[PDB]
Amino acid sequence: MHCPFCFAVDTKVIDSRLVGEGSSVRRRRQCLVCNERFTTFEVAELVMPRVVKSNDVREPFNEEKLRSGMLRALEKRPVSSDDVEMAINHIKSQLRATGEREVPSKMIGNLVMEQLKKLDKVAYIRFASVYRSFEDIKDFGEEIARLED
Amino acid sequence: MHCPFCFAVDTKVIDSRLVGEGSSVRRRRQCLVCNERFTTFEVAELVMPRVVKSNDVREPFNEEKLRSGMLRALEKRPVSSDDVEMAINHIKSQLRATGEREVPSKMIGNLVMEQLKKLDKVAYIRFASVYRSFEDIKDFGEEIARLED
Ligand SMILES: Nc1ncnc2c1ncn2[C@H]1C[C@H](O)[C@@H](COP(=O)(O)OP(=O)(O)OP(=O)(O)O)O1
Ligand SMILES: Nc1ncnc2c1ncn2[C@H]1C[C@H](O)[C@@H](COP(=O)(O)OP(=O)(O)OP(=O)(O)O)O1
Ligand SMILES: Nc1ncnc2c1ncn2[C@@H]1O[C@H](COP(=O)(O)OP(=O)(O)O)[C@@H](O)[C@H]1O
Ligand SMILES: Nc1ncnc2c1ncn2[C@@H]1O[C@H](COP(=O)(O)OP(=O)(O)O)[C@@H](O)[C@H]1O
Ligand SMILES: [Mg+2]
Ligand SMILES: [Mg+2]
Ligand SMILES: [Zn+2]
Ligand SMILES: [Zn+2]
């Protein structure tokens, strides 16, 4: 990298330690031209926040996982492929607007529930049956009554 | 093929016409050893009946198409992978027991509905919502009331 003082396009690396407790790499660099030393930090930049799953396992944001769940609930429903992509881009925008490096998968689920509530109410019931995990048939009718309010 | 009269392991083909209106190939064969002639018919043997789709399109029986639909409805349900395979083999046995060369996809759907009715009643409602195509939220509660009888 460019020397921050003289501006030689290349500096030699002097040291490499894991100072951010694994999260970051600290390096020392020396300029060949002006013989000056400087510290650098190498940090990871995520395109989308990492997802914290129900079992506290961290995994990368998977657009396909998000899409498939919606498409399953929107089977035989009058929602175009554009409406789905339009809802996915808005959910992505909402997860970025939090500013968080990681987001609970429950948050992704609630965002999908709000898109489906606007898109199709049958698709909403289908997704809620697996998302909220209805363990009884009664649970189905109780979620329909919840939607009338 | 073997001559049906003398039993020479090979006979020469004399003619080839599409007599079964495409469904069958008729051939004439002459034996090299005894100089006798005989007619043969070549017919297609299906492992499982071909499926007539809702739009009258004929397509081969796809075990994966059958399985996926069940697995979608059985999401987060206490039905083991063995229970699913046990239900699929029984549905396959039932389609073969008809003796038909082709079966309506509606018949495959009703068979899955009866397996899910035995396996899990929440999975049954999930599959019925896409299979019977609920076009309204009311349709959901009306199918729950149908199950109580
Ligand atoms: N058959 C279905 N009908 C309606 N909605 C469904 C169906 N299957 C899944 N969904 C919805 C509700 C679920 O909470 C959501 C995500 O499904 P799930 O199988 O948990 O996938 P996922 O994207 O979370 O990946 P993972 O395999 O890592 O859990 O999709
Ligand atoms: N999300 C879902 N929840 C519950 N059951 C589902 C879900 N998606 C599909 N099913 C059930 C009901 C459907 O009638 C059945 C078959 O689904 P469908 O998409 O029509 O596939 P298929 O096997 O008929 O293939 P094809 O793509 O040729 O129509 O599976
Ligand atoms: N890695 C991921 N990236 C994007 N969406 C995800 C991811 N994992 C799960 N989802 C979505 O989060 C929502 C809720 O998932 P859920 O099944 O409740 O969580 P989990 O996978 O933690 O058990 C669904 O819309 C699902 O498709
Ligand atoms: N080619 C196939 N082979 C096996 N099962 C199939 C096939 N096509 C559809 N099915 C199954 O038939 C049932 C009803 O399908 P449905 O969606 O009602 O019909 P269609 O595909 O004709 O629109 C479901 O269990 C589905 O998975
Ligand atoms: Mg999941
Ligand atoms: Mg189908
Ligand atoms: Zn320098
Ligand atoms: Zn012969």
Helix and strand element counts for chain B (H, E): 5, 6
Confirm or reject contact between A126 and chain B (CB < 8 A). yes
CA-derived radius of gyration, chain A: 24
Backbone angles phi, psi at A72, to 5 degrees: -65, -45
Q: Which residue is associated with the tokens 């190498």?
A: A42
Q: Are B47 and B96 in contact (CB under 8 A)?
A: no
In chain B, residues with a C-beta closer than 8 Å to the C-beta of A75 are 130
Of B75, B122, B129, the CB nearest to A122: B129
Tell me the count of A-B CB pairs closer than 8 A. Answer: 46
Strand order in the sheet with A11-17: A11-17, A24-31, A37-43
Measured in angstroms, the resolution is 2.4
| Nearest by Cα to A24 from A40, A42, A50 | A42
Domain residue extents for chain A = 11-43, 50-148
**Sign of the torsion angle spanned by Cα atoms A6, A8, A10, A11:** negative
Q: How far, in Å, CA of A111 to CA of A108, rounded?
A: 5
CA of B8, nearest ligand number: 8
C-alpha angle A13-A17-A18 in degrees, rounded to nearest 5? 135
Length of chain B: 149
User: Which residue's alpha carbon is nearest to atom 22 within ligand 3?
Assistant: A53
Method of structure determination: X-ray
Which secondary structure element, helix H or strand E, spans residue A7, and what is its range?
none
Task: Compute the 3-state secondary structure of chain A and give helix, strand, coil in percent, each to the nearest 5.
Answer: 45, 20, 35
Report DSSP letters for B36-92, one per residue. -EEEEEEE---SSPEEE-TTS-EE---HHHHHHHHHHHTTT-S--HHHHHHHHHHHH
Token couple for B73: 């409805």
Which secondary structure element, helix H or strand E, spans residue A56, and what is its range?
none
